[PDB]
Design a protein around this ligand. Structure first.
Ligand SMILES: *[C@@H]1O[C@H](CO)[C@@H](O)[C@H](O)[C@H]1O[C@H]1C[C@](C)(N)[C@H](O)[C@H](C)O1
Ligand SMILES: *[C@@H]1O[C@H](CO)[C@@H](O)[C@H](O)[C@H]1O[C@H]1C[C@](C)(N)[C@H](O)[C@H](C)O1
Ligand SMILES: [Cl-]
Ligand SMILES: [Cl-]
Ligand SMILES: [Cl-]
Ligand SMILES: [Cl-]
Lengths: 7, 7
């Protein structure tokens, strides 16, 4: 993970 | 990707 979003 | 670094 480590990313974010939101999709 | 998804991992990091820095090499
Ligand atoms: C992770 O490194 C890339 C280069 O490969 C940069 O372009 C990017 O800004 C950097 O990402 C940030 C944001 C993220 C992905 N949510 C994490 O918090 C990382 C550690 O920092
Ligand atoms: C997403 O990350 C930001 C930056 O650290 C926090 O401010 C935010 O609280 C966080 O979102 C929470 C709530 C969410 C979107 N429902 C998910 O549970 C994420 C993983 O954590
Ligand atoms: Cl994560
Ligand atoms: Cl992070
Ligand atoms: Cl999402
Ligand atoms: Cl690197």
């Amino acid at each position: 993970x480590x990313n974010x979003x939101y999709x």
